[PDB]
Amino acid sequence: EKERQNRLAEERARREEEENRRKAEDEARKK
Numbered sequence: 001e002k003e004r005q006n007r008l009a010e011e012r013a014r015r016e017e018e019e020n021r022r023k024a025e026d027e028a029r030k031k
Helices: 002-030
Strands: none
Touching: none
């Protein structure tokens, strides 16, 4: 269970950092 939950949690965090760098490069284009 913990293996599964941690895997899903890192998948979530990776998607989150994807969106963060994405908004970052968007703002960069606005610059």
